[PDB]
Amino acid sequence: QYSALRSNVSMLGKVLGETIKDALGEHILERVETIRKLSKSSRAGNDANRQELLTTLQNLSNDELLPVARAFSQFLNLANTAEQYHSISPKGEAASNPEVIARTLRKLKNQPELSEDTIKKAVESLSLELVLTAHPTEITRRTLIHKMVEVNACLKQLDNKDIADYEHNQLMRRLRQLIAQSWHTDEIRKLRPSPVDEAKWGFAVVENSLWQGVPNYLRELNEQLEENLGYKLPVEFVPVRFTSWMGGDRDGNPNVTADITRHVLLLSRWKATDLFLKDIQVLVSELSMVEATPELLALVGEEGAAEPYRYLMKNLRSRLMATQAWLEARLKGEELPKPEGLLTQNEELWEPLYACYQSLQACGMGIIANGDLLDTLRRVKCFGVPLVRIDIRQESTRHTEALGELTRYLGIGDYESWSEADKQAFLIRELNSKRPLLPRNWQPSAETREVLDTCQVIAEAPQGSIAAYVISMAKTPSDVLAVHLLLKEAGIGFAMPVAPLFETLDDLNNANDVMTQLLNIDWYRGLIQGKQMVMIGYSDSAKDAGVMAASWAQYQAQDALIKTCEKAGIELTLFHGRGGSIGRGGAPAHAALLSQPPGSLKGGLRVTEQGEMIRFKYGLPEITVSSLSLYTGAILEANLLPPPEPKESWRRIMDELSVISCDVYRGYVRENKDFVPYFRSATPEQELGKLPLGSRPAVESLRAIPWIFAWTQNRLMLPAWLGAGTALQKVVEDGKQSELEAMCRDWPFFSTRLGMLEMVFAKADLWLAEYYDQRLVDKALWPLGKELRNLQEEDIKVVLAIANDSHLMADLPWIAESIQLRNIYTDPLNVLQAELLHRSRQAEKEGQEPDPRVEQALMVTIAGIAAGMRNTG
């Protein structure tokens, strides 16, 4: 079964080892082989080999550090590519086999009490919007997407049995070339990337995978609809849209200025012109058809009425080339009027393209119409003019300060002192006011000016470039009303979707109250035009209260909001954030989406795909088809077959669990006096902040990402499990274990919550965790480490006991197996990383010079460990 995968990893590793021998050494290969041996030994109890391991690492010269690190990082890299190849190959788990869609559609179709029209309308109302996010540990300076597409193509071809030995030889020769490139093509950011750089990586994902991936997803989905149900969605219906937060999210990031966003907004347009030209060229040459309709001929009428379809593609070609030229100037900083055929809306690309499609169908050229034209048609609506719409995100606090400084300058009062009823009073008065408020030539502070300039970019940008304004830390109705006032002042002609982001236990708790007041304001209700979009901050609430309380809190807030909006007639859209069980990808994800309160996906799927998981969910075009197909079935099933409502006793088990768990979690994280000092020593948290990892500049202070990432590198995974098990053991100790087991079998929310601990417990590593304490933590803090490690050992038993199994995550053997592989490949990077942190941390203590070798090897481990661990939050 996993034999083929085991063979490929072994094959790619020999090739790497070959390349390293050629490269520079047999010595480094020995540096690598001694470290694995010693590490395996040490773990298996040999305390003499632990000594040996410690001396071996300490004797590594600084010149050996990076090459050794990169080696370990590379072996892991081939392991993941062997892992991902296996996943889409038909003689392996086969993630992109269209049965994934059909299995879901068959289930529905033969489910009594499910009218076919009920099914058809759910189909016709599908909607997915995937919001790309930056990768927090992207270490190189150029995107590697395209090389990966290539290694994968080579593995695909070597899979053909009966391949003539010469073909085999040829394939292996390129494979060695491609691996060598990676060992020698070293790039390492020296400096913190910038929002433009991160915006650029998203364009790389779009062109190396989404560009082909989306249209294929749409063809397969369509072939399946018609096969299983008897009808194809209409050409005009493209249910997928991609959006990006890159150069749009300034929450906590001073480097994302209104100037940067302006810039990135332009760049996207430039890149869409680039990709759309490649599509249009193809079309200009293949559309030599001369048979056309009255309507189409009319549309050209003479001049090009002797090459009709070609005509309309040539016109578009110029129109695209003109706008390209204009944006390359603006990118450059030059201002010059815009050409007559400047492209700003998708309708401008759609229209002509759709006209050709229509005649070709009408005139008997169906097959040609449904080929590359169809693909460009779907890409216009999926990507269009802006390529990827961006989302703007700023904290609520920042809006309050801007509007406070404004009010004091006008002598009206001080907004950040007024009670909430006064703020709404002031906001509704001004929102209805016809006289401006923003002083024409004002002198605000840097911060305020930024808030003000950003809304001017939004307002200045063509409609459909910006998908939504997200308000992180939204706590009251004035928080939402505040951005509508600023946008009004910025001059905006359309209705911009504003979304509160509730990301704390109380804000989640108060969320429903906050929106019912907002919908009771008649002015607000008519401004949103029957649609609201809320954002649920799972990851931050879990930082606040622990994962159990956060999950139940989020469960309750969505159910309350779904019901509130339904009473009020508003189409609610839940915007999902980062991690959680909805961001696990694959089957768990599909289980997860279905485990949400009934109603939850009635207004669509909108999620924040984590940066570090992009390669694994959209890395190759076939993975994109898998990912979109999985999501698509989930929506459909969740909307026609919602989960049951919880048995009241369950609710009381969850209330309690939530209190015990939050109580234990805060016990340690907030109340325990040794925790912060422990944390800072045991995890590479401080270094993740100094090093040039994300574009943000170098426990309540911290952000979800750095909280999660730091514990992931240490291997304890504290954030993702902490009070859950403790609370669960206690409830069992009351004899309620039988109810916990019923909740698991019959309540999707609950099994899915327990499922997720299993995977975290599956990647955590207590031997490694203990090793960092031994090397990095002061002796007096060891007891706390031992305590937290023992908490986990006990939490795995309760979880295994409730799950009635003896092996963790036994329902997902392929995920289990793949986690087993990466764990062994990741092993040596954690062993090495501890030495680097030690060398690094002692240089500082003794006012030394950040050695560049030591720092770069550390960035390699960080990024390798993060890649081997994937999702851990």
* Integer Cα distance of 865 and 868 in angstroms: 5
Task: Rule CB under 8 A: choose which of 125, 181, 293, 346 binds a second copy.
Answer: 181
Minimum CB–partner distance for residue 140 and ligand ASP (Å): 22
200 touching ligand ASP, by CB under 6 A:
no
Q: Contact 612/135 with Cβ under 8 angstroms?
A: yes
Cβ-proximal residues to 721 (8 Å cutoff; 6+ apart), any chain:
547, 757, 760, 761, 764, 792, 795
The radius of gyration of the chain from alpha carbons, rounded to an integer in Å, stands at 28
* Residue 672, amino acid: N
Decide if 135 is catalytic. Answer: yes
| Residue span binding ligand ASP (CB under 6 A) among the ranges 177-185, 414-422, 527-535, 583-591 | 583-591
Rounded to whole angstroms, what are the CA distances from 34 to 38, 403, 617, 687?
A: 6, 62, 35, 27
For residue 500, list its beta bridge partners: 471
106 part of the interface to a second copy, by CB under 8 A: no
Nearer residue to ligand ASP within complex by CB, 39 or 581: 581
Distance CA(331)–CA(334), nearest Å, equals: 8
Q: Is 818 in the site for ligand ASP (CB under 6 A)?
A: yes
Candidates 202, 585, 633, 873: give the one binding ligand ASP (CB under 6 A). Answer: 585
* Nearest to ligand ASP of 193, 755 (CB atom): 755
How many angstroms separate the Cα of 548 from the Cα of each of 362, 560, 659, 756, 799? Answer: 58, 18, 9, 11, 13
Q: Are 806 and 812 in contact (CB under 8 A)?
A: no
- Using alpha carbons only, give the angle 608, 123, 558 rounded to the nearest 5 degrees: 45
Q: Please identify the residue of the shown chain whose CB is closest to the bound Mn ion.
A: 540
Kindly report the CA angle at 71 between 70 and 73, in degrees rounded to 5?
Answer: 60
According to the binding rule CB under 6 A, does residue 861 interact with ligand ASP?
no
Q: Are 757 and 725 in contact (CB under 8 A)?
A: yes
CA separation for the pair 323, 270 (Å, rounded): 8
Query: In the complex with ligand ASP, which residue's Cβ is closer, 483 or 821?
Result: 821
Contact between 870 and ligand ASP by CB under 6 A: the answer reads yes
Residue 286, binding choice from a second copy, ligand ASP, Mn ion, none, Cβ under 5 to 8 Å by partner class: a second copy
Residues 192-221 that bind a second copy (CB under 8 A): 219
Task: Work out how close the CB of 821 gets to ligand ASP at its nearest, in angstroms, rounded to a whole number.
Answer: 10
Q: Which stretch binds a second copy (CB under 8 A): 86-94, 237-245, 639-647, 657-665?
A: 86-94
Site string for Mn ion, 452-481 (x = CB under 5 A): --------------------x---------
Q: Which x/- pattern over 31-60 shows residues binding ligand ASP (rule: CB under 6 A)? A: ------------------------------
| Cβ atoms 391, 466 nearer than 8 A | yes
# residues contacting ligand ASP (CB under 6 A):
9
Position among 254, 364, 491, 852 found at the interface with a second copy (CB under 8 A): 364
Query: Catalytic: 338?
Result: no
Residues 133-172 that bind a second copy (CB under 8 A): 142, 160-164, 166-167
Query: The tokens of 158 are what?
Result: 């070597």
Find the shortest distance in angstroms from Cβ 160 to a second copy. Answer: 5
CB of 535 to Mn ion, least distance (A): 10
Residues 496-555 that bind Mn ion (CB under 5 A): 503, 540
Residue 472, beta-bridge partner list: 395, 501
Across 647-736, where does the E strand assignment appear?
Answer: none
From the list ligand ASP, a second copy, Mn ion, none, pick the one residue 670 interacts with, judged by a Cβ distance below 5 to 8 Å according to partner type. none
Site for a second copy in 11-40 (CB under 8 A): 19, 22-24
d(CA 89, CA 656): 46
Per-residue binding letters, 392-411, with a second copy (x by CB under 8 A): --------------------
Candidate list 543, 590, 602, 736, residue with the active-site label: 543
> Counting contacts by CB under 8 A, is residue 90 touching a second copy?
yes
Amino acid occupying residue 180: A
Give the distance from CA 624 to its chain's centroid.
Answer: 13
Q: Where would I find the beta strands (DSSP E) of 203-282? A: 240-244
Nearest to 336 by CA among 325, 344, 347: 325
Structure tokens given for 84 = 């991902």
Q: What are the E-state strand segments in 627-748?
A: none
| DSSP label at residue 385 | T
Q: Which is closer to Mn ion, CB of 483 or CB of 635? A: 483
Assess 759 for contact with ligand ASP (CB under 6 A).
yes
The residues pairing with 394 across neighbouring beta strands, listed in sequence order, are 471
Are 723 and 662 in contact, with CB atoms under 8 Å apart? Answer: yes
Contact 490, 454 (CB under 8 A): no
Smallest gap from Cβ 135 to ligand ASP, in A, equals: 16
Binding interface with a second copy (CB under 8 A): 19, 22-24, 90-91, 94, 96-98, 142, 160-164, 166-167, 173, 176-177, 180-181, 184-187, 219, 285-286, 288-289, 364-368, 371
Can you give the binding site for Mn ion, defined by CB under 5 A?
A: 472, 503, 540
Q: Which residues in this chain contact ligand ASP in the complex, by CB under 6 A? A: 584-585, 588, 759, 815, 818-819, 870-871
Residues annotated as part of the active site: 135, 543
